[PDB]
């Protein structure tokens, strides 16, 4: 017999001690080697309750990613709390690696395997594992990059769909590549390319899932209403540089309800003066490395907030969310919960 509990997980990975890359270096000193032959035990006649929105595993991951980022992406100039810190800012090798989170003795991770599980509620197919799957700590906003896909249908996730202050996490069942590039020979200017055919078809599928949750109302997408660039734009880090991409075109309702078929190109910029998601403040980094900077990634999810207001119209409006990077971890850790044996 067991009970829900909270303990200090350890982490495991396949990091290379020879690698100069930042995630690998961190992982070498923080984690242990993965298990070649893991063990999964599918529990029969066992129904367990899961809540991805009160899962403290997310908290521990967040602490680790904040750790990793502080010990790696050190700014040349730190501006926080009315003071100025001037450090050294060498260019780094940056490519996130899968990190496994595991329970110690006395504790076990329960895994939900319901193919349509939405994050909250009971689960029928529960298995018992020692470690989660490998999760890449991909810090991003609006778009969830390089994550895991939903098995069956597109899954809508929210702690409460009626609360316009709760984040909505859209989980895709088919990835859409985003190809972001800063060429060689304004060096801060860049761009991302998306297959408009694939995107508008996934987006069309997403509008149809949201209709199932919102009484067949007209679903409408819109750009963000306000906030810092870190949330009004697709914000992510590629190869060490901080990218800010304009997703206005990505949320084009025209191609959902002709000619839209083609290659979408989002305008991006690499910033050196950014606001730290760590929650501290404003930092100054060095100019971008010379040469073609490129990373191809899977859009595997979307973060959305729903417009509130005492209206009476028969349509809902959604806008690309973000900010709480804890939600990024929720989207991968949702099927896990830690229990203590007796």
């Amino acid at each position: 017999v067991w009970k829900d509990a909270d303990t200090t997980l350890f982490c495991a990975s396949d990091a290379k001690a020879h690698e100069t890359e930042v995630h690998n270096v961190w992982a070498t000193h923080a984690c242990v080697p993965t298990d070649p032959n893991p063990q999964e035990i599918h529990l029969e006649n066992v129904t367990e309750n899961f809540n991805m929105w009160k899962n403290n595993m997310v908290e521990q991951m967040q602490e680790d990613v904040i750790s990793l980022w502080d010990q790696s992406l050190q700014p040349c100039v730190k501006l926080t709390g009315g003071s100025v810190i001037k450090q050294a800012c060498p260019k780094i090798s940056f490519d996130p690696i899968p990190i496994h989170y595991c329970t110690p003795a006395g504790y076990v991770i329960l895994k939900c395997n319901d193919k349509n599980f939405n994050g909250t509620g009971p689960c029928k197919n529960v298995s018992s594992v020692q470690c989660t799957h490998g999760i890449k700590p991909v810090v991003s906003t609006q778009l969830l990059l390089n994550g895991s896909l939903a098995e069956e249908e597109i899954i809508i996730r929210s702690e409460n769909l009626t609360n316009n202050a709760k984040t909505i996490i859209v989980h895709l069942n088919k990835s859409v590549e985003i190809n972001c590039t800063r060429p060689s020979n304004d060096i801060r200017k860049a761009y991302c390319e998306i297959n408009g055919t694939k995107w508008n078809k996934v987006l069309k599928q997403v509008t149809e899932k949201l209709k199932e949750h919102f009484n067949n109302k007209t679903i409408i997408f819109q750009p963000p209403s306000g906030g810092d660039l870190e949330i009004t734009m697709h914000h992510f880090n590629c190869r060490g540089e901080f990218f800010y991409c304009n997703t206005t075109q990505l949320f084009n309702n025209t191609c959902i309800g002709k000619g839209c078929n083609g290659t979408i190109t989002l305008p991006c910029k690499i910033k050196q003066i950014i606001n730290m998601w760590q929650g501290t403040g404003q930092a100054m980094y060095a100019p971008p490395i010379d040469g073609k900077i490129n990373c191809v990634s899977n859009i595997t999810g979307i973060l959305l907030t729903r417009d509130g207001g005492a209206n009476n119209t028969s349509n809902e409006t959604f806008r690309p969310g973000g900010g709480n990077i804890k939600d990024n971890w929720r989207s991968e850790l949702y099927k896990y919960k830690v229990v203590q044996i007796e």
Binding site: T162, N163, N164, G308, G309, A310
Partner: protein, 208 residues
């Protein structure tokens, strides 16, 4: 939907106030109090839980879709306007005001036909006065050629008189001079506890 009832409570200190909210969707409901000239104040949250500083004379209940705030033993600082909340939405409010008990008094009903001075403007106002009544609760309905009127009338009520503890009400029906000349019988119907039957005062347009 979030429907709050009643609109006004007229109570004496010591009596109890029963305010209700009917909702279309279940979920955490809160109640707020707003004293005159002051910012609102959370009274009950999550349906029945009492906020800090709130005495157990306040209490929340829910039957089906009906959430209820009851306030036993009304004190001076308990009067004001109360609102119900669910997420970003609010009820219309319940005004809880101090009433001085006195014996029941039926209103005197007078009706005033349009001024000949006003009729030269192009509008026609019919005024119906309900004089010196108690309690405050009073219904008025306008009838023109025996047809119930909607949305062309505005009411007004006086503060409780400091001498005789009665109220007075004035309702005004507004029609164009053209619309007005189309009909003969104009009437206001008054129902009040002081009346055995609803009293109707009327006039026939054109005749004196």
């Amino acid at each position: 939907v979030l429907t709050q009832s009643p609109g006004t409570l007229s109570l004496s200190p010591g009596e109890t106030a029963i305010i209700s909210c009917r909702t279309s969707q279940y979920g955490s409901l809160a109640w707020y109090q707003q004293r005159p000239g002051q910012a609102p104040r959370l009274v009950i949250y999550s349906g029945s839980t009492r906020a800090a500083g709130i005495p157990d004379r306040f209490s929340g209940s829910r039957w089906g879709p009906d959430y209820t705030l009851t306030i036993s033993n009304l004190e001076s600082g308990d009067f004001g306007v109360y609102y119900c909340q669910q997420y970003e939405f609010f009820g219309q409010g319940t005004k809880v005001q101090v009433d001085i008990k006195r014996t029941v008094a039926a209103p005197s009903v007078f009706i005033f036909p349009p001024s000949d001075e006003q009729l030269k403007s192009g509008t026609a106002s019919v005024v119906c006065l309900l004089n010196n009544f108690y309690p405050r609760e009073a219904k008025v309905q306008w009838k023109v050629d025996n047809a119930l009127q909607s949305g062309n009338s505005q009411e007004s009520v006086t503060e409780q008189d400091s001498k005789d503890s009665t109220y007075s009400l004035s309702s005004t029906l507004t029609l164009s001079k053209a619309d007005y000349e189309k009909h003969k019988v104009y009437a206001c119907e008054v129902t009040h506890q002081g009346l055995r039957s609803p009293v109707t005062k009327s006039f026939n347009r054109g005749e004196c």
